[PDB]
Design a protein around this ligand. Sequence first.
Ligand SMILES: C[C@H]1O[C@@H](n2cnc3c(N)ncnc32)[C@H](O)[C@@H]1O
Ligand code: MET
Ligand code: SF4
Length: 367
Amino acid sequence: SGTFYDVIEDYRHFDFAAYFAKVTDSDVRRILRQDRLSALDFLTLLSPQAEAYLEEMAQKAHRLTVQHFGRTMLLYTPLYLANYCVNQCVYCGFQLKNKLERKKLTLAEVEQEAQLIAATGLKHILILTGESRQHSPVSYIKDCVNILKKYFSSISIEIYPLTQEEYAELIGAGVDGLTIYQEVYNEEVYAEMHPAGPKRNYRFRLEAPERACQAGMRTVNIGALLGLNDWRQEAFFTGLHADYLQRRFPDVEVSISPPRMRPHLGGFPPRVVVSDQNLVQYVLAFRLFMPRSGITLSTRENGRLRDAMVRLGVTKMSAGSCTAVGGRSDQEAVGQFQISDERTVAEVAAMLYAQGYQPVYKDWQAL
Ligand SMILES: C[C@H]1O[C@@H](n2cnc3c(N)ncnc32)[C@H](O)[C@@H]1O
Ligand code: MET
Ligand code: SF4
């Protein structure tokens, strides 16, 4: 097909358990000495055996991150514009069958929240909507982007997947970043997590980052939703997808997120448990695989864990977040999921200073 779905097809018969069974401690030590890592060297760093070398991995991953990013940490925050959605994502608080107050911000409410967020010093903003081309079509997001570009120098979207021409229209309006999570790369698990709605189309969402990069998107952020499937395999396909995009679009800045499932309206329990050490090994392994790729850490993680991971390869953190439409002015507003780190921008910035890190607000200052 000429997309990343061809790579997924080539790994449909890959025996991950047989590969891990062949991994030894000498394989891990060799890879820690290498300059460049193949996709399977990355898979070897995700292995149970590699847990014996997490200290050595963190030592090297910290050095690689300082080399390409300096002692900086880019800050951003999400802005939910609307929560209308036709999809039935079992893990999400905005799924169609959930009962909540559906709301879409007027243009004046968007500008007011933009002023509230800009008053904290943030220059990077990420906007989100549900999948509802009737209540939040591309034209609506285009009008919001035009207001937001008065306050923020970098606007990223995390919305429903678009055609290449739709992305090109939003890039022309001032969008410079794309965040889209494949959620789960296993097609069988994906079908169970998405029983109804256009999001059930596995290929259309898998190929969204490419259509965006072809339209000229500057940066793309991807990731599997940790908790939905075998985490090592999902982490591997996130790195493989990141590597595929970076080799295909050498001028695009490719980043990943390792978001873990959180409590949410609906109450769906995650299929597998992902521990804090799993999350650390994932981040460390990916930093060694792609040393120049950004690694975003959201407020799904608690403050103490995010403070530990400042020195572990994370390059972008959210602060002062809110997952509800208008929840910054309404404490009873229902969010997409429950956040963990409730710290403001200022509290996160003051913590970073205390660790010897420079909080930055524009992405070109990370060096
Ligand atoms: C905006 C992103 O938030 C993630 N997301 C959706 N539902 C949840 C949840 N219950 N917990 C944590 N993250 C979630 C999805 O991966 C979605 O893409
Ligand atoms: C608000 S969830 C993220 C945006 C969109 N609904 C998606 O799942 O891709
Ligand atoms: S994850 Fe996105 S598409 Fe799925 S129910 Fe939530 S808002 Fe809708």
